[PDB]
């Protein structure tokens, strides 16, 4: 089971998964690391 520090965040993540944005959100996600 997946009972963790997520759920609603995972719901957002699923929405983030639902958010395709091919090479759009992908690009931001790369730069989300970047200075990580």
What is the full DSSP assignment across 1-36? ---SS-THHHHHHHHHHH---TTTHHHHHHHHHH--
C-alpha 36, offset from chain centre = 15
Distance of alpha carbon 9 from alpha carbon 6, whole angstroms: 4
Instruction: Report how this structure was experimentally obtained.
Output: cryo-EM
Please, are residues 19 and 25 in contact by the beta-carbon 8 Å criterion? yes
Sign of the C-alpha dihedral computed for residues 8, 9, 14 and 16 taken in this order: positive
Name the nearest CA neighbour of 10 among 2, 21, 22, 1: 2
Distance of alpha carbon 7 from alpha carbon 33, whole angstroms: 23
Which residues, at least 6 apart from 2, have a Cβ–Cβ distance to it below 8 Å? 10
How does 21-36 read in b/e, with b if 16+ C-beta sit within 10 Å?
A: eeeeeeeeeeeeeeee
Documented resolution in Å: 5.1
């Amino acid at each position: 089971r997946k009972l963790s520090q997520y759920v609603q965040e995972m719901a957002l993540g699923g929405p983030i998964t639902k958010e395709s944005q091919p090479t759009i959100e992908e690009d931001l996600t790369r730069v989300y690391k970047a200075i990580s």
